[model samples]
Target: PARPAHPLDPLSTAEIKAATNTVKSYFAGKKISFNTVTLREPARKAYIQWKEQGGPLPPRLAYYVILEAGKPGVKEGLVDLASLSVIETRALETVQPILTVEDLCSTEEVIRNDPAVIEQCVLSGIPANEMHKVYCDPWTIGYDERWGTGKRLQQALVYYRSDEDDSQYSHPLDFCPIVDTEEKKVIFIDIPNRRRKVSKHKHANFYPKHMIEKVGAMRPEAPPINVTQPEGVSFKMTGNVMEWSNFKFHIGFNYREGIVLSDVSYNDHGNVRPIFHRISLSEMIVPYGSPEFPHQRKHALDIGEYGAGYMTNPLSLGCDCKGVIHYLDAHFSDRAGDPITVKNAVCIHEEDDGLLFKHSDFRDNFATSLVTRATKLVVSQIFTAANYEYCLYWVFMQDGAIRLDIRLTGILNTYILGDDEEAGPWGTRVYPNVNAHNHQHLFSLRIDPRIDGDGNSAAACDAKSSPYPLGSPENMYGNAFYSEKTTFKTVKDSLTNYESATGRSWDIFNPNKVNPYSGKPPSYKLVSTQCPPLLAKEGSLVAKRAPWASHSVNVVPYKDNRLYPSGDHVPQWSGDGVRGMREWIGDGSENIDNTDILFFHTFGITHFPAPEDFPLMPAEPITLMLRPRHFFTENPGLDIQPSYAMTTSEAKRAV
Candidate 1:
């Protein structure tokens, strides 16, 4: 009869081992049947090649060290994750206490305000709708045009930019994904969508035109872009996919109480989205429609779930925006069934204020080396003394786009499920679409904010040029792309030593040649066309015109804080203790000039709730950004080498 524990709370050691046992049991059945997917080796080789050409971005590596439940090492030591025993004890111990104190403070504050309750502990299970949604997630809470919310807050953990003097391609995709000189490896995160050619003859035209491309099969002599080729980039995944449920239970109710769910969010109707917050997080590995734990199989296991009609407290009431919840904001709404909308929502809730979390005249949070003037500018513009407890930060650069993060602060509960508990542990289903279905979805991506067509956010990008441009680094934000153009490669084989290799059939149908007849330049449009087509009126027209009308911006690294044209002048509020930030868009319109793009990555589908998640809880997440001009004349860290370097300073040590 008692409400479930907040989903982010920690369990006893026995509970955790039991949970681990269940996971191991599930794997026992599939370990033999599954194929190991390799994601890193090939990409590492290509990185070496990029480094040989020229040192591109200094690659970055991230590792976490768990200390005793009571001890957290100095800042730099937190980077390498060197000692497993220390990691198992101290760091986690220290973080645990912070959340414990935060949770107690919040509970006391809520009960104190409850005039109706006489006995203090008697109000324990009183569920309030105020616990329905998370407050001020810095990552995803940025300017979202759909529900109309956001403000830029630049925050970065892992980031790099190329030293290329060319502003044309200074963005992450073009530069940061290049070779990493420090590690002598390629940062495998630069995978682009391979443009596919869907011939009209094979088309049913069911999908949106924006999602399809028209192209014929590849011919021997076709232009470079015509052939079905893979983008020479990809990110090598580093960590195992942690199911949503696992993370939820681990960080949910165990640390706090009264919160309803990890992603306490809303539907288009502004109604609170329904969530079990106590179901298994695993999918594709369990059975569906079992007699017991129906809710676990129904709402929790189904991958195609939507928050269609739910409203939530816009301002989180009793929740601890600072300590109990880390990243807290994610909104994907369906507008009258036309199209879905996404917003940039991200928040950071540090467990406690350490020396690194300082508020100096120049800056706050020594963890971030912000420019003194820029930091001061941000502090003066954003903060008021009245706001207290937690700092709610948000950033959004693009109008129709979004970025957000949700981090559940508190003790994490890792528990195993039993057959009686559900079809199997972790709420996995037969198909095992666990990874894809239950991806953490750190953030969502929406194309043109044309769902309702009001253009409420178009002004965010209402600058001169678009934030998305062809072959430029600026367009790397939002990580979304619309490309129809094509380029071809000149075949020069040294292994075969032949202009034309054996067994590879070819015709001189369409050679890479300038138009002798029209005296025009060679275009990538020819890559997909035949010589006959190229010589035809249509071919010539395609050559003169742009093939692809496309653009993309980083998704997770949404806008932290806007910078002046020079990237030197700072925005009003960046990292100051504040609850409200400015909106990236001025007026909602269709044609905005430019907007910032953000990029983010999630783990897997299916979020299982744990004892820590009792009575509801949220998740813990992080967002990132960079001050290119303010911090560096160029990208100052662009050339820094990747290594087992100290990420934090020792006690009383200065960098």
Candidate 2:
């Protein structure tokens, strides 16, 4: 019934503006003018630990400031709340902070309005009439600026969207703009001048407007699907603390990870059991596998370059989510230090999962049965990383299963190709002239499981069968199959892979505690569905940059402020830029057993676009399930009754 403050509460609009003014004045006293000031949530490890044991929460803010005068250097420091001053001024040596508008929007206006850039696209083959259709979107270049650079720059991919239709199709124009914000101009125009066959594959070919004012076949006209809270909402919310059914957790937001849940616990019988201390989406990379020009360099670390939380799209009723849903608002600062609300950034609701379990028996003309239905509580969030829209769902079931489901749906990045259906090994021709490049959407799910407590251990459990036949020493009955477990004592052995053939699974359990009924430690098992490894060559830039994608599961000891799988700044860098999963598990010699730990579950899909994926791509669900192992004595859902009643009846005959 008590609620504590969320440690990761984002910087408010007021705080952002106040910090901006403070920075400006502080520098003005030294006769300096700042160009850009980006506010970030300072690391709260010390604050979080102190407050968890009933201590006052610390007030702090971190920001990356760019100076306009005196050489325009990049500086980062912390701001003390009580004094409203910046402290610990230091040069940005390795990586800069991650922000959305500062990273992408700056280039948007430059590319869209630059006359030189527009003329180049038109002369390259695009008709002058369709010049206005051209729009530019920012991408993380991931190139090393050490080779040659001035102010930090970003790469822009120019695409065309029709002004007459609502289709999501965006055709690449094969022209790119290298935007230099410090100079406020297009420094270099990298015009590949590739074929423009697919450049015209907009709404004119797919879902065109049939009328000027009326709806078309592409426009949706389906009836509404509404969700009602008949008995009112079963969940109660007090500030950040949320209590629903048997689950209790705290929800908060940050610039990097959109929705973060902390202090998650579940009621076991009458006792409360601790599960995950925190859980968040660490980082995501969508790398294109084209061998052609400009395509090979197409790799984006959405969370590291342009934050996932900042790109969150507001949810709407009946469209984004259905059922009795509650909305949570997210607050963050703008470039000018003004706060903005990403309204309805998160949605929470309960869903019916149909029958959970059932059994029946008939004896002496009477029937006896037990049937139980299942319902799940879902916390949902969606992020629109340019053309790709990812819907992240965290589902908690009554049967002790926590499912992480990511639905990928959005417009495919297509290019104009010749009549030949086969363009290259890297792409597939979805339309006659439109070639949709092959790419992999890789994501890392960060799980901080406390299990029974903070001290925990991880091991691999495999269901294997011996090769021997009947009457053999290895397998006497030939039908004998056994479960084998390989426990990891250190971080080196903890980094593991999934073996699908043997039904291999990984478990995180508390070594000190044991389940009452099973006489074994209570554990949680992670199983992935439809997950694939990166097909990119081992030494390739994509593979090297995203080593976490190389393996299915990576177990690392918990360290304060080590949140991102990839380093904080990923816009312009080379191999393993700054740091990634490889660097996070440094040397792999740290002890992981019976200590606070994190499991990075990575899953991906190799995409080759088809005709149906043209205007809009249907959602492809990639899922990972975390199920409790011998955690409870019996079915935790058995006590719940079904929504409907059923009785057996017979008249000397079975019916």
Candidate 3:
């Protein structure tokens, strides 16, 4: 059978151009200019049926346009090619794109072209003739106590853009240029005198001579080794549907969610069983705590505000992925509906995970052994949100286990410091006077689990030891450990925390589908390897905005509008945010027993920067795994064959 076309495929170049011209003609009388025009995905229910069952493809092209007439407004319009007309045009007054590409382009051009800014760079200690080496990015605004009126201005961080031919280096200039986006100029310069102390460390320069001459490597490189995929790729991709071994899923890209997987199913006994309807990161909050003005409000919602899709880092051939890889390109259209291809936006590859399972019979005098190799299908994407780079990976194992890993790497957001002792408690001194704030990276994932089918049940399984009962048959032994499974009654009861002492985990199962062999409901267990609750004080602005971070596990009944734990419009209203997760958990009365469910699994890291993180921080990975509990009758991977062991003669013959 042939594979079906992906309904969520990005609009073609011709379609984008036509849509742009169509919208322009509709607003021909107006003096407004368009800021961006991008594709808007259709409703989930509308496409799922068409994808599973053969049916006519939908016939509407939805495009969202950002306007810059007198004020900013978003309009979503659906175009009918048959009539060459717009059927619907809804003015989305409250909606905003995470970042404006036009603003970024204007910022760079205005700063780089202006002769006055070039003079200022020289006065600020940069070489007069090397103005081209100066680079800047729009600094994110945070919520602080200083801004009482709830109004803030935009600013840009100045950095030295490195060059191979130049003798000098490129680094953050310990200063920021106040930007007026409307005026397209730099109004003021903030040269924090405390951060003026120059550190010899350079971030962009990778020359061995430059690095070794200044800051030598603490650890040297090892001998080179080769990794190869000998049998080529075992996975096949038709449209957006990917199939590998027993795992099959449909992948879609979004401007907000980046890589979203839908209809994730695993073949169980020749039957295609559903796993998750949708799996994607909903929101991520990285709140920096500082006592100073502007700095205190330094909280960023990467997914909610900046968008995972907006900042996708294009992947390189040999550097980003190893072995055979299939690269997918995402189209990003400007206000004029001009297309900019973000090449290698998504990478699909297979990786070896060493041994799957091994056993040896000890009963025989001469033991016999059986061993098998493990292979995983990995779907990956990278997003560069300001100073940090986040690598998101979804790994599907042959054993029916799925894992989500977030690897964080990039430079630390540092600020000028007055004294090492004064800033000692709040952050670490990465450079001479630059303090990298101690912060927490809280990420929330929206998992729409379809365990065996659509209707699923979630329960908290707590392992508890029996207490000694006087003359009781149940407590005859002093030590007896058994799991107590508790089904949540409501939203309030569903929000859970990780109890380290009790070894508690959450299980999501299909209540209607029971494993005949074990006489138990087929379920998947969610286990957090490293999870920490938000360190923000209760009732604080950060706490108020991100109330969902208080718990490690949160299960709420599915609602169409409840995609984000924090509100849809984040960073815009930090203190008293509207439409956030707090508002979603209103009365907690909705029934979620054996029905559609939404799982919010949060994981975070408390970072105290060291000198090693000065120029560029090392990658720190946090993992969340969903393993099959009673979902399988037995070991599903027991049938996988062992890897070929190359003999000495075979290796020589190949060489």
The candidate scoring highest on TM-score is: 2
Regions of model 2 farther than 4 Å from truth:
1-5, 29-52, 55-73, 93-99, 112-116, 127-130, 144-150, 161-170, 193-226, 362-366, 467-469, 576-578, 644-655
Give me the runs in candidate 1 sitting further than 4 Å from their true place. 1-310, 316-393, 396-403, 408-424, 428-442, 447-610, 622-655
**C-alpha lDDT (0 to 100) for residue 142 of candidate 2:** 57
- Candidate 3, residues 357-447, lDDT tens digits: the string is 8775554421345678999889999998778899999999988999998899977887655433456777877665567788889888888
Which residue pairs in candidate 3 collide?
Answer: 142-297, 142-298, 143-297
Which runs of model 3 end up more than 4 angstroms from their true locations? Answer: 1-4, 31-39, 52-63, 77-85, 92-96, 108-134, 142-153, 160-178, 186-205, 215-223, 419-421, 467-473, 575-577, 644-655
TM-score of 1: 0.20
- Put down candidate 1 lDDT per residue, 506-535, tens digits, no spaces: 111112223444442211110100001111
Error of 1 at 433 (Å): 25
* Cα-based lDDT for every prediction: 0.19, 0.71, 0.72
TM-score of candidate 2 on Cα atoms, chains taken together: 0.89
Q: Better model by TM-score, 1 or 2?
A: 2
Q: Candidates ranked by lDDT, best first?
A: 3, 2, 1
Candidate 2 residue lDDT tens string, 25-68: 66665544332333344333554466456766555554645444
